[model samples]
Target chain A: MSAFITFEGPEGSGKTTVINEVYHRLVKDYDVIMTREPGGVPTGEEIRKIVLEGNDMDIRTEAMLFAASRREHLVLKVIPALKEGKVVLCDRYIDSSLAYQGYARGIGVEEVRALNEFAINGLYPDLTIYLNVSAEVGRERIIKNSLDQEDLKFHEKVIEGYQEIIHNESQRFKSVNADQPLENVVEDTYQTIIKYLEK
Target chain B: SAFITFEGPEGSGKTTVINEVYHRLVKDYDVIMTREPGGVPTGEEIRKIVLEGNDMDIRTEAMLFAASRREHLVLKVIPALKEGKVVLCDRYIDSSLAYQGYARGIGVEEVRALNEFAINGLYPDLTIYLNVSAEVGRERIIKNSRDQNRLDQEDLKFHEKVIEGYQEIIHNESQRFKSVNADQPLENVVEDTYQTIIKYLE
Candidate 1:
């Protein structure tokens, strides 16, 4: 009667658009709820605001705050909806942190995993949808001397990190190709959820 | 140049004792004193969430505390230490080890690892532990004033667990800690703490 589903994608992955469309189609006949980190809870909202507005925050501190925000949202919103037997479709979960903070930002994945494991206390998503954004969508020219290369390298590392986790957690994850047309992406995600729920 | 911390259960007179020691140290040594869950802008915002969010999950609270600790250290304590100043932090990793880890029923080692990640292995050179019985601490809290925060509102049993938690930490890391009887007269506690710190400085 209850399940936790999470969506993950890099920027420009069209994850938000896909998840929204999928949620509407799924909501027709299921008890479904949509949420993201902080999930509008008061404490979590405050935490999120702080992180966004914070200037020059330490990376480790940023990771910790993300975990903390995730915890509050899980406890206050996700868990409650779960107990009510709704299908919780979340926008992003642990994998986002794993890719961004753990790998891309150079805090070892194992470390970020442990930190998040401490926060979530074993409430991993029942299903994780990884929207695999194609490499061709936004390829920057390799201006050999550009300072922007550092930032580009980080994005590539994040992609690599996600792939590593997907392989590591293949059983629980379903990969969706985000390179297709918007409708195709939505339909693909929608079917994936329906099929998973049918199991 | 050293980073020192003060740790104790609630009502252990950490505020009063740290201030007294800071005043004494500032007379002859370059020094700065600050408290945890705060000290910088980002850290203060985190602190507001913690102190205001009484119903927050225990693990969430622990993570927030670690975040606040990291920001405060990176933005405040480490800078002062680099400038050849003795940095006196009111609380640090051991506070989480004792309060969130042991007293709150999360494993100490787990919280320790979490904090180690936040601190990146930067532990205090010395920690001043204000040792006091739970009863004495409770009495002091009652006698001191009426405006109690969420942590101070914890019952006597929880405070006892905090004490036991601290004892375990001290037992494990004896070299890094020095204990003083916080139940002693204010001046005595200050004198003992000041002397221990001065010896370490020398």
Candidate 2:
């Protein structure tokens, strides 16, 4: 069975470049499908519009919307591809909710985790590759956004949350320092993923 | 502190009764009355989108409803309540618990959890349940739908199950409930509802 792999990190962590390169390399050996949540299915795409277009929504509602989109995408897209024996390389998944909504927004990780676990029916990922980049570097690399400064204040907490997950669940996560050059990040990611595939 | 909500099956005349009560009470108090899934402009727009039913599953539908409620509660209902107005909401979280949770088989507690996240601890202080026999409610829907040049599928069996759904709900939470027998004539139902509200208001 082809495995499901996910990339997790903050914005400007070079996830897209890494995913593209990794997707290109892996497509040669296996059937690889690249997709993201809040998409993949028509229903999820509509939900994604609601999430992206709406502003100043309540935090808890925001969490529910994400879970709803995740559910739709999981059922319609990811599960089908996995059943067809494809390696699903996704950009982000449940951990983003755990970090951003749970720890960073102070909504409690347990509550968010419980809600998402219910949505997914407890289907945990086979492998997750966390691209580790400091919040300062992430912010510096990218500029000019419309969200509040208070939103940025939560990024450190998001990084901390991810660190804890990576530290605690070493089996699920393969961590790499992404603050280095793009070539290095790409190479390091390929090596880590190859190691897992070999096993 | 009267954040009263009205609830019942689909064809129940809860809104008509509530509108009459609002007309009588608006002369004496600053009363803000609204229905769920579309209370504010944003929420109203959200309603139009979701109500079209674009293949969203049980989880997505439940969450989208909660999302709309969050917008409504934040923009409309909570503000009115905070302004010291007696807000009479047409339907509230109990509707979800009965319809989506019980009837649709999503489980009461699971849907309730989604609603709790949306409401963020904002429960109505009181609920005025219009308890109508589902057979009569189904007939009313048939009559109502015929006039509108469309026929709905709210047969007696469906509404009966819905009434039982609410029965299962109100039994679980009894502290904030006030039931009104809606099988009576309009004037009698109106008078009883008014008396109940006045008793609570007084």
Candidate 3:
């Protein structure tokens, strides 16, 4: 099944490292296209700069901006690829919004989920590979920008958030241990994606 | 109670109803009225795109409204709210919900999120929905010869979707929303709004 897929986890979960390699190989065997969230089309690029340059603005405003950026990317880049029967390898998608802004940022996962669902317009990826991590960062603000607001440390809440969703959407979500050394994680991610391709 | 919006399909007397309310409220309280998709500079750009013509998909249109709202909230609505002003907008988040979410077939729950995020800490205390008739409203719009904005780009069917959209919203969010039938005479329509708002203030 040629489908849209994404990689999601806390910052430093090795998403980029594993995804880059997996993307390189899959594009050859299949008509695969890789893109990242917060930036794909032109206006999205401007939005990415505004978000990443972090002005310590009101946190919910940040979420809306991200929502708009995702909307632009989805319309301009991702949907076309999927429409043409190509695999869309989005680096991160709706799950990041749920866990980070919704769960970790005290915005309620449901709140973030609804915003993202509207932005995505009911486009759920056929599969999502969670790059599972635990106790990695005291303070890291990558794409997720997750800092714990609910339970335990920000790191713990971020992982917990992802886990919460994993159960809610078991069929669309799969996991591989990200904390277990780089090579194993990378190879495992590739295999998981391959299975999704077949399934 | 401090912030509010007016919403309805085109030719629904939203502007006319709010105009009289704004003038009357300005005498009794520190009040100001605004229209959405044109509140701030960024919103003006978004409004232009919406008004002129846009071939972009519904998602893009949704994003544009959110972006426009983000700027309007920060630069205008929130600041005014902080100053303790009773701010009134001709159309705000609810318009996006009906226009993009309902009529565009995008889903109100989805649109609500973007706007909820845009509003963030600040929310409109209430919204007065003009429960206007699609048939009469479209007849008026067509008769008026107003150039169709992105939301006004269809005939009876699209207008019906917007009216249906408002019904779903009022049903789902009745606590914060109050609907007044715009099909009634204009004088009665104005008085109903003034009374509803007085009740809200008390």
RMSD values for the candidates in order, in angstroms, are: 3.3, 2.7, 5.6
Candidate 1 lDDT score at position B40: 82
Best by DockQ: 1
Lowest lDDT 10-mer window, candidate 1 chain A?
Answer: A138-147
Supply DockQ values for each candidate: 0.84, 0.58, 0.27
Clashes of each: 0, 0, 1
Q: Which stretches of candidate 3 lie over 4 Å from their true place?
A: A42-54, A137-156, A167-173, A177-184, A195-199, B12-21, B37-53, B63-84, B107-202
Residue runs of model 1 more than 4 Å from their true location after superposition: A138-150, B146-154
lDDT measured at residue A78 in model 2 versus the true structure, 0 to 100: 91
The alpha-carbon deviation from the true structure for residue A114 of candidate 3, after best TM-score superposition, in angstroms, is 3.4
lDDT of 2: 0.81
* TM-score of each model, in listed order: 0.93, 0.91, 0.71
**Candidate of highest lDDT:** 1
Error of 1 at A39 (Å): 1.4
Pairs clashing within candidate 3: A148-A154
* Global lDDT of each candidate: 0.87, 0.81, 0.78
Instruction: Encode model 3's per-residue lDDT on B1-202: one tens digit a residue.
Output: 2888888887788888999988888888898887764446555655555455436667767776776787778878878888998888888888888999999987787677667667764657889988879776876676566655533446568889888888888887888788888888778889999889888878
Report the poorest 10 consecutive residues by lDDT, candidate 1 chain B.
B145-154
